[PDB]
Amino acid sequence: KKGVGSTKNGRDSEAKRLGAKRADGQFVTGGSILYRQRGTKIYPGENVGRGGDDTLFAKIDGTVKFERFGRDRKKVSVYPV
Amino acid sequence: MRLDKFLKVSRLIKRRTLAKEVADQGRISINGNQAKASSDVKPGDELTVRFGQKLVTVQVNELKDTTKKEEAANMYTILKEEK
RNA sequence: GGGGCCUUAGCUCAGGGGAGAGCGCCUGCUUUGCACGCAGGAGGCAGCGGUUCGAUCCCGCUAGGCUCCACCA
RNA sequence: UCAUAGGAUAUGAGAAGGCAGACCCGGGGAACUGAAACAUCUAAGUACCCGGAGGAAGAGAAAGCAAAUGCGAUUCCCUGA
RNA sequence: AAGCAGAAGAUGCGGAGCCGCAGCGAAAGCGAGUCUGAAUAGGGCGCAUGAGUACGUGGUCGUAGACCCGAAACCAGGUGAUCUACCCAUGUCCAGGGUGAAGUUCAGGUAACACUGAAUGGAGGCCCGAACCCACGCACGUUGAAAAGUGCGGGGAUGAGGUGUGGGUAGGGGUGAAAUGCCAAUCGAACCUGGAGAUAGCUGGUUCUCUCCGAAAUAGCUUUAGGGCUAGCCUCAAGGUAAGAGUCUUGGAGGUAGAGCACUGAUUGGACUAGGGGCCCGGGUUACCGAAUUCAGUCAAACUCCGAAUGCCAAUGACU
RNA sequence: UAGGCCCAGGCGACUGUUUAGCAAAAACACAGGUCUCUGCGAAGCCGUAAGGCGAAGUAUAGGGGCUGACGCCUGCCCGGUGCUGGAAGGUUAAGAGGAGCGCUUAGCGUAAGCGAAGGUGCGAAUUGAAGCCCCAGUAAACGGCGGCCGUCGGUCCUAAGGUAGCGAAAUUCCUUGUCGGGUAAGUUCCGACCCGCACGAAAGGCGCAACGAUCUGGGCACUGUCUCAACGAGAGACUCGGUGAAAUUAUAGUACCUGUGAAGAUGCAGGUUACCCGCGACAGGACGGAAAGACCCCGUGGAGCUUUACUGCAGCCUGAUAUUGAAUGUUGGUUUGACCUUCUAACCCGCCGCCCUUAUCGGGCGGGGAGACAGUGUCAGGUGGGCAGUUUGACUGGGGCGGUCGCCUCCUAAAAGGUAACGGAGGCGCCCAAAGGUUCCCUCAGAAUGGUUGGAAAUCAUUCGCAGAGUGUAAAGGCACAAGGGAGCUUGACUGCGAGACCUACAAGUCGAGCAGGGACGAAAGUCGGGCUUAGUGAUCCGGUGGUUCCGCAUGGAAGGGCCAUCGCUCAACGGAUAAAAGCUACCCCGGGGAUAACAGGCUUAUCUCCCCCAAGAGUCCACAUCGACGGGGAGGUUUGGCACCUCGAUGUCGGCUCAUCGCAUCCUGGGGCUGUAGUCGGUCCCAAGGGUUGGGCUGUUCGCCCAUUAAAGCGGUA
RNA sequence: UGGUGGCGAUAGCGAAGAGGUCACACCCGUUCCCAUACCGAACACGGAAGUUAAGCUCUUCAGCGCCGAUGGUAGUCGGGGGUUUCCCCCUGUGAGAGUAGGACGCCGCCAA
């Protein structure tokens, strides 16, 4: 028998549950978050706000819609009734 | 430090071997006490020595190990010579 | 094979801001003087890679060496 | 030397020892265990040993409870909990 | 309730006490409000959306041996030196044979001795070898004749001897020519009783039937990994009730397969060529090497100009 | 019936003793040697103490440690640890002390508040022993006795670097070291050599006559130990009569080939074979019986043992105080206490005499000796494995050792999210008082040109230039309308909060518009509750600090507590068992496991063995007579292994003996092809498994080497 | 023309041309506001002598960049099969790349 070891590549961070949390056409309350992220994969739009964690929340109640800032750049927005 | 190392760095004796030899002969002493190459030293020490009949008394000011040549003699001072 | 330490001038050493302290062998010189010297042999970070404006000095991979271990049936 | 120790004698239904493997009063006083280990702690002042008892013992007539136009020895029970 | 009366009873008396009806606050305290707070703000907890209580059955839990059996072990108090270890006191046994010391005498020898040879002498943890004692070598026996022996040989056998009798040392201890050995067929800490139904995240076992429903073997944390807790998955009941699910349609996020080289890296070949040579007179040639640039080409989990199917999230209605 | 003998060697001097019941010994002991302690109430030891052994002894004795007759010897280191002694100085307890500080309160007080005395609590200076720090000595005390470079020298370090003697050893892995002896042959033995992995001088070194049921080697004699068995006697066995158990046991009318299957079938499938019942024999199987595996692992199991693990205890040393008082001096500040001397009456005497008393107990008297000491009690400090109770992590492709343990980023990850492995790569345990906020401003890196020092590369103007730069830090995402770079002013790096969401077992973590208060920048809109986002940190309990229209056990205060804010932990094993903790077990034990290791079996076949492909090349020439490179593809399941599937309520494991059996990839024999086959002998290949396929030395050995033979001295499977 | 907004560069890059009395710009000077880490380049302040050169508008083009079909193919849910480190068949879906081609602008409000 032999003896070996020392992998030193055996860890990783805790998974942080990013991505969208509400869907297009879905009704939303005030203050609800929509898209956890890091930096801006997506920007805010109308009646939507960004936080210190680059997270997107609805300032009001309404319905969600995702769109594009012209080219190669996305957006969300809340539109009320 | 040790006596033999001190003597070499201070260039009193050119060889640590010779320092050991003389200390084993006991030709020398420290503070009136017979001593050995392993004898501990320090600043302020008063050292008696022999070279045949030439007896010497010196005083220890400093101690180190890198000890370039002319800076060696700064390590100590002569006091007196007898025979 | 694993872990730790080390691998700087011929030898021994220190030193992230530019590798420098001492010592020795051989030869030569040298001379009035109680071994009191001098010049040359020669003075070069084990190697590879990376970070930095920079690496001996931080990190990593590998080699050479020293020590420790390599047990139970 | 008094004198004392000590000795001698006579009286004593003295006390000794036992128990019922239970109850109580005290002197000594474990560990396992639990704590998911463990030492503080618990188990537990238990078990056990010892000495004393009595039919009960122990405590008991306030150097108290308390905080109201105050209660009046101890003990034990229900509550308080 | 205790308690009194009452046949060991039911019952009556007994309202001291307990639960609830109002909560909030750490608390003072306030009160359907209260706490925070500077705040008539907001927010939390509460009320408005009210039913508890006593008793009984059943399920479950907690504390007690708490589903049953099961340890090795620990402590306390006692019993044991009739085995065995050692010691004390007193007794006793060791067939026969051999060796031949010291000393003494004689003789030689010496100045004396020393020394030498005989005789006597009779020592010895001396020799050989029975009883006796011990156990190395083998064989046999190994549900034996025997819970350690027998047979054939073996060692010691007048010395640290063997043995008897009577005694002593007692366990957190004793004894030990020391092996951790012996201490009543036991000993890395004796045996009996008791604590004690020790404890056991461990194994084993857990007794009649039928019916309804029906899993998990995953996450997280754990001196935790074969255990446990919560969540997940099952069941029962009461409510809400029709939210759930499937498909169709519509819209979304998401950058995987694939593909590609626009980035980062790796890479092939060619062209030109900076530059550096070698050749001739500061030039003038060389295909001798050759940067970059360029043409075309291959590749990638940690590379993307791109980008699906599926899946995922929702909305509308339709159908089921 | 009563020795077998000899040669040589190792170990131990010897006779003796020992694991009753596995081990008789090289172990123990021994006489001898040495060290140390101890002045007699010895010392040591037992005991709580009395009382005792020591010893009815007295340093030529007694106790303890080490070594082991005898002979020659027993080298260097005292640096460390121990002991011994010293001890000027530092540090250090309890006790004494008693400056001050609080609290309370009479009183003063308009109030705030101050506040004497007393009580109470806390209390500084000062003093305060041993011990420790420190200095010497000691090695037949613990213990230790080196390396580098050069062809004896030079050098580094040491406290010192192994003297003599011995040496492949009871120590030597390499190793069957080399040589020689012995032998046909000698991994053994002997003698020498020494590059002693890792001898060595009282853990004694070397030698050594005698001794040994010691270990080892060689030789003579003798033998059924063997070649290779044969016969005979007796006891069992066998038959008959009498008597008559046991272990075990799910029921059983219980066959073998292959295969399957929890991977090794009697019992299953298919096929083959087999009349029914017994007796004597064998022992291959029933993974046979026996013994809940003694190995391995696990248990927050146990016991024993060690120690510079933790915490404690005994014991010992030391000090204060009470017993414990009378003096003479001395020095201190206020008489007082302390210190040195002295005395005696306390206390003590395992000293004498007398009486109790025929008494070595004690107890009274008298003397004597010591003496306020000692001893004892209480308190305190130190030492203290002598002793006790306990701890001594987990994961783990068995365990151990290694490595890791929490957080962040990416890939793996399968286009939501999430997703493991001792899978792959890297980072954090911070930083900035401006690197924050706001307002306003502008836009990078590199390249080509020109230009002193300027240089390939500063700085320069210059056009090209989505971005090749930067973004405090790792990476990913993202950002150039800035989140990047400058300047001004400032501190929102605020207080109270928070609808509603995310993530989530919980604990927790994350985002958040908006309200109020008060502000900063800005004219204004308006932004600001830290930073470009993601890490940069830890519970509770316990204490500490500050503040407080809270409580404060009769009342007023207070102590103390609560609330708010905050500090203290690599508790890193990072959801932290305690404030406090390491090891050995081969003397071991219990509970469990095939959930987990060693043998064998099974799957795989990297490895191993064998076969084959291309064919360069060797082969004088010639690839293929025979070899066959770089490379490639397969078979087998004899190796080393990997995985853990049966077995831990037991599957006995190497080698050897006996017994064989099977395969063929054939060693011989047989039959052939080719040949770099003249012949004889051979090489290679093909078919062939019928039969056969040696005896010895060394080693436990397998294997292997050697001697001598043989036609040949085959390779493997069958637990 | 000018200002100001919206739509993915089908808007852009690049080349060629035309215009400016009004307008927009360039441009002329700092005395003041203010400013330039240097300064009237820029920012501000005022002015209008001259210039369409540049900027800005209007035309042209398809060289660069941009958009982008159809068909086919890879891939693929699902079903099935096979000599299974992979491959094949079927309904369905369906890219990228490469093409066809499109395009050097569409829409608004105000002022003269």
Curated annotation (Swiss-Prot), chain A:
Domain of life: Bacteria
PROSITE patterns the record matches: RIBOSOMAL_L27
UniProt organism field: Bacillus subtilis (strain 168)
Molecular functions per Gene Ontology: structural constituent of ribosome
Protein name: Large ribosomal subunit protein bL27
Keyword set, alphabetical order: Ribonucleoprotein, Ribosomal protein
Pfam families membership: Ribosomal_L27
Family label: Belongs to the bacterial ribosomal protein bL27 family.
Phylogenetic classification of the source organism: Bacteria, Bacillati, Bacillota, Bacilli, Bacillales
Annotated InterPro entries: Ribosomal_bL27, Ribosomal_bL27_CS
Subunit and partners: Part of the 50S ribosomal subunit.
Coiled-coil ranges per UniProt: none
Function, in words: Plays a role in sporulation at high temperatures.
UniProtKB/Swiss-Prot annotation, chain B:
PROSITE patterns linked to this entry: S4
Knockout or disruption consequences: Not essential; synthetic growth defects can be seen in double rqcP-ssrA mutants. Double rqcH-rqcP deletion strains grow normally in rich media. Loss of Ala tailing, RqcH is still recruited to the 50S ribosomal subunit. In vivo mild decrease in tRNA(Ala)-binding by RqcH.
Cysteines joined through disulfide linkages: none
One family name in Pfam for this protein: S4
Effect seen on changing R16A: Synthetic growth defect with ssrA deletion, loss of interaction with 50S subunit, loss of Ala tailing in vitro
GO BP of this protein: rescue of stalled ribosome
Residues of the S4 RNA-binding domain: 1-62
Keywords annotated in UniProt: Protein biosynthesis, RNA-binding, rRNA-binding, tRNA-binding
GO molecular function: rRNA binding; tRNA binding
GO cellular component, one term: RQC complex
Gene3D superfamilies found in the cross-reference section: RNA-binding S4 domain (3.10.290.10)
SUPFAM superfamilies, per database record: Alpha-L RNA-binding motif
Subunit organization: Associates with stalled 50S ribosomal subunits. Binds to RqcH, 23S rRNA and the P-site tRNA. Does not require RqcH for association with 50S subunits. Crystallized 50S subunits are variously associated with an A/P-site tRNA with or without RqcH, as well as with P- and E-site tRNAs but no RqcH. Displaced from the 50S subunit by puromycin but not thiostrepton.
Miscellaneous remark of the record: Activity of this protein is best tested in a clpP or ssrA deletion mutant; ssrA (tmRNA) encodes the SsrA tag added to nascent proteins in stalled ribosomes by trans-translation, which targets the nascent protein for degradation.
Alphabetized HAMAP family for the sequence: RqcP
Family the UniProt entry places it in: Belongs to the RqcP family.
Free-text function comment from the UniProt entry: Key component of the ribosome quality control system (RQC), a ribosome-associated complex that mediates the extraction of incompletely synthesized nascent chains from stalled ribosomes and their subsequent degradation. RqcH recruits Ala-charged tRNA, and with RqcP directs the elongation of stalled nascent chains on 50S ribosomal subunits, leading to non-templated C-terminal alanine extensions (Ala tail). The Ala tail promotes nascent chain degradation. RqcP is associated with the translocation-like movement of the peptidyl-tRNA from the A-site into the P-site.
Protein name: RQC P-site tRNA stabilizing factor
Source organism: Bacillus subtilis (strain 168)
